[PDB]
Design a binder for this molecule. Structure first.
Ligand SMILES: Nc1nc2c(ncn2[C@@H]2O[C@H](COP(=O)(O)OP(=O)(O)OP(=O)(O)O)[C@@H](O)[C@H]2O)c(=O)[nH]1
Ligand SMILES: [Mg+2]
Lengths: 210, 177
């Protein structure tokens, strides 16, 4: 409610995210061949940093634009054991043709600019358990009423195997968790692209406590 | 003559301010944690003119997964700690030395104590006293430098410019041999 201070903090954070976007882009531009990082894990990590900062920047700008254009039980919401099932035929492909490509995934969880979290990279080559990618992340939304919403975004990168760039991580699914979600463990993703390797669901645990 | 310099060290130990004061003579006042950033500076040492590529790296956890992208083709390493942080000096042999030696096997290392101006600092004694710490002493630096097999040891302060040129002249001589 202190608007000058809030605007200064949003603006400082926007500049910070733009610096990350610029520098992650430069890092990717150095990946000219194998010796120099092309097709490497570090390239995937840079793609991830770039994606996150781009997304965070967008949220901050939307919040700032809002600012400038102007009883209920409270608790925490906790998400855990996120798993992303993939189609069996795709899983078989990673097994029989493992040098074809590197497939990375990550999940972004958001409830505003203040609460935006991205999982570490997960790959089919070593996060795949059964038919599902496992993510270690736990996300906690605290002190909120029953009108809360947590937006989930699923991203994938295929690594075949200014100067500012857009991340090669592509959005391959989304879901908004709310009060009605609590206690459920299986969710049907929206916006899954045609011919995606995703089975279609995301699995997780979502719990409220005061 | 082109030489590539890479600078590494704990988060906020003064790597970027050192590079920017050397290359641009400006001291960046507001802290922005580095992800990946390269500069170029010209320098003449011992009558030899050298174009130094300055590769800046992240000290901070969020951003430190890219660091290996900076290591290829390195001619000289600046390995940094801050004079107001013995914890950062502590980290030299624990993590920084092993990482650098692995990625940069026979590249010479200059051990550099940053923020020299903070050795006589009311505020720093206080913070460190609470931690039981004593602001780093030149002998401690030199000793670690000898411990880790560094080509040399230098102390500087980006804020006052004191010792900066000397740091990069030494780095350049190491890169030429
Ligand atoms: N007093 C004093 N402060 C300094 C000096 N050098 C850097 N600082 C301050 O220490 C903080 C860290 O500066 P940076 O140069 O950005 O540190 P860094 O090692 O590049 O940090 P990372 O990129 O996150 O790894 C900044 O706020 C600087 O203003 C110095 O020589 N003297
Ligand atoms: Mg820096």
């Amino acid at each position: 409610v202190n608007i000058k201070q809030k605007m200064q903090e949003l603006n400082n954070e926007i500049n910070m995210q733009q610096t990350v976007i610029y520098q992650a882009s430069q890092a990717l531009n150095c990946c000219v061949d194998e010796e120099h990082g092309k097709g490497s894990l570090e390239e995937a990590e840079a793609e991830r940093l770039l994606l996150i900062a781009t997304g965070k920047r967008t949220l901050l700008i939307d919040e700032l634009n809002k600012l400038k254009n102007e009883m209920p039980s409270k608790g925490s919401v906790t998400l855990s054991e996120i798993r992303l099932p993939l189609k069996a035929d795709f899983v078989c492909s990673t097994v029989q043709k493992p040098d074809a490509a590197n497939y990375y995934y990550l999940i972004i969880l958001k409830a505003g600019a203040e609460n935006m979290v991205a999982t570490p990279l997960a790959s089919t080559s070593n996060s795949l358990n059964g038919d599902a990618l496992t993510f270690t992340t736990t996300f906690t939304l605290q002190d909120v009423s029953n009108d809360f919403e947590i937006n989930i975004e699923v991203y994938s990168l295929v690594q075949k195997k200014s100067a500012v760039r857009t991340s090669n991580f592509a959005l391959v699914g989304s879901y908004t968790l709310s009060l009605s979600s609590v206690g459920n463990t299986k969710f049907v993703l929206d916006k899954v692209p045609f011919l995606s390797s995703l089975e279609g669901h995301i699995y997780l645990k979502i719990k409220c406590q005061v | 003559i082109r030489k590539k310099l890479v600078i590494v060290g704990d988060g906020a130990c003064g790597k970027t301010c050192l590079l920017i004061v050397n290359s641009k003579d400006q001291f960046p006042e507001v802290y922005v944690p580095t992800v990946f950033e390269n500069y170029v500076a010209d320098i003449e040492v011992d009558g030899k003119q050298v174009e130094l590529a300055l590769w800046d790296t992240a000290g901070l956890e969020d951003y430190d997964r890219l660091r290996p992208l900076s290591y290829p083709d390195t001619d000289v390493i600046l390995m940094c700690f801050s004079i107001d942080s013995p914890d950062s000096l502590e980290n030299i042999p624990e993590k920084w030395t092993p990482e650098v030696k692995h990625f940069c096997p026979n590249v010479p290392i200059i051990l550099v104590g940053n923020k020299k101006d903070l050795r006589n600092d009311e505020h720093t004694r206080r913070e460190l006293a609470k931690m039981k710490q004593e602001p780093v002493k030149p002998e401690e630096g030199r000793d670690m430098a000898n411990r880790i097999g560094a080509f040399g040891y230098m102390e500087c302060s980006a804020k006052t410019k004191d010792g900066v040129r000397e740091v990069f002249e030494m780095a350049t001589r190491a890169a030429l041999q």
